[PDB]
Ligand binder design. Structure first.
Ligand SMILES: CNC(=S)N(Cc1ccccc1)Cc1cccnc1
Length: 283
């Protein structure tokens, strides 16, 4: 059923809360035993948001390999994503270790450091060129190279150095700065515009490791970003762009990380973003 018409049918019937609970009911439940070990309590931002054991990213160290991060592998679309929480004061070194070890080119940040008067993630990148950051626990150095500030987002060029080998790599930081403190954006135009720039950078392409995507918990805004990208890529590949079922793509993604799309409003916004993107994606 053309998602356009499915959209108008749910809107006129005001059944968004009913559709959303149906997804919550059918979603996968897999064990998260490593996340719940007592040694890992200060590595989790939220007690109720954990990576599944089968899809968790492992740090390459013998001491403690745990980080709150999941590999979302979309087989038909040929795209992979790492979805993670906003880094904590004691996991900023782990965060940059993961980017290094997974060979990522891009980091996508969908939150502000402060929202609703509370801290939603650590200040984990340098704000000035001449004041670099050293992560002593993982042996990494991070330098700000350049910053491009736009009305709806900021792009930064970062240099990550493995202090053990003196290898360096260029990481691109894509920071969506205008998601409102409550609800979702009224129009998906600026979110779609931001997505286009991520792809254009090469950050989502198979020559690199998977893109790292985060918000505060790494399931809500983060879920919306990967769901929209994957649905638009499938509409480009299929002979019948009308066979793309957004609810079925979301349940596939929820096999790899719990709780993706946190509200009925985020579900409606994901439909709007894909729907608007179709007309353009259609040539
Ligand atoms: C309102 N912007 C839309 S719907 N875009 C389409 C799109 C397709 C796939 C992924 C992201 C975005 C972007 C764009 C940029 C420059 C000129 N036209 C369109």
């Amino acid at each position: 059923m053309e998602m356009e018409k499915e959209f108008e049918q749910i809107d006129k019937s005001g059944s968004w809360a009913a559709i959303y609970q149906d997804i919550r009911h059918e979603a996968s439940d897999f064990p998260s035993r490593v996340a719940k070990l007592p040694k890992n309590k200060n590595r989790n931002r939220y007690r109720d948001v954990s990576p599944f054991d089968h899809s968790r990213i492992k740090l390459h160290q013998e001491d403690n390999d745990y980080i709150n991060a999941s590999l979302i592998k979309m087989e038909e679309a040929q795209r992979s994503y790492i979805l993670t929480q906003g880094p904590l004061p004691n996991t900023v070194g782990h965060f940059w270790e993961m980017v290094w070890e997974q060979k990522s080119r891009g980091v996508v940040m969908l939150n502000r450091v402060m929202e609703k008067g509370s801290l939603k993630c650590a200040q984990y990148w340098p704000q000035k060129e001449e004041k670099e950051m050293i992560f002593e626990d993982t042996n990494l150095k991070l330098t700000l190279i350049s910053e491009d500030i736009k009305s709806y987002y900021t792009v930064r060029q970062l240099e990550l150095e493995n202090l053990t080998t003196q290898e360096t790599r260029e990481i691109l930081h894509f920071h969506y700065t205008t998601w409102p403190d409550f609800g979702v954006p009224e129009s998906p135009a600026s979110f779609l515009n931001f997505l286009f720039k991520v792809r254009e950078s090469g950050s989502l392409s198979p020559e690199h490791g998977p893109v790292v995507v985060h918000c505060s918990a790494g399931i809500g805004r983060s879920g919306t970003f990967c769901l929209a990208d994957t649905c638009l890529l499938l509409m480009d590949k299929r002979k019948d762009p009308s066979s793309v079922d957004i609810k079925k793509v979301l349940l596939e993604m929820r096999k790899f990380r719990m709780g993706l799309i946190q509200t009925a409003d985020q579900l409606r916004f994901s439909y709007l973003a894909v729907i608007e993107g179709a007309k353009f994606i259609m040539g």
